[PDB]
Amino acid sequence: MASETFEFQAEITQLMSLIINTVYSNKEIFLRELISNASDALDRIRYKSLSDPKQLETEPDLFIRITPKPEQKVLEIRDSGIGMTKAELINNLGTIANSGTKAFMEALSAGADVSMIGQFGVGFYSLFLVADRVQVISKSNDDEQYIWESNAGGSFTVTLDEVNERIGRGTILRLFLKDDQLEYLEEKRIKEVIKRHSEFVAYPIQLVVTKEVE
């Protein structure tokens, strides 16, 4: 329908600024963070399902799926985890500074590896290493499908989703890659990052590859 617009908490805006404007070299850790987040979302729905089995019926398969969309310069990271409601997207992705935002920034300026970002509970924002824009598309059993969108600006939008494929249940991180980071559309490069930083993931990690038939 129509978008609602929200302002980022001052700390989160600062964090995004740091990250988006970094010379940092090890940018590939963004994928470890998103996969770990995906894995956590999958842990949640599975634990929930222990005493509420019906929760799984909206998407019985538990998986992490990565889909490069080279034409649009887009990389998607999807999971069939618990998903997030409209209120969760608003409350947890910007309007309330995470418990570790300022501390991570303090740590960063002291010499800390950007890769520590996950230990501070703000690793979602690492996607800004390789992307200048992001849509978080999410369907929780408890709500309708919604789109959360940010370009690292000081505000984000949340919109009821009438334009994307239905996700049964879970979350798509749709990354609009920067022009210098298009290597992450490549099958070989993706595979390599996964093997190096994400060896111990309990769920299948699927890669969607689009090849011309000869």
Ligand SMILES: COC1=C2C[C@H](C)C[C@H](OC)[C@H](O)[C@@H](C)/C=C(\C)[C@H](OC(N)=O)[C@@H](OC)/C=C\C=C(/C)C(=O)NC(=CC1=O)C2=O
């Ligand atoms: C331990 O929980 C985690 C927290 C608290 C987080 C808001 C919990 C959230 O609400 C309670 C859901 O329960 C949880 C299932 C949803 C995800 C992990 C989403 O990931 C996917 N694929 O669904 C993630 O990204 C879309 C949303 C925000 C992540 C933040 C801002 C971050 O920077 N790091 C974090 C990583 C975490 O694991 C973090 O803060």
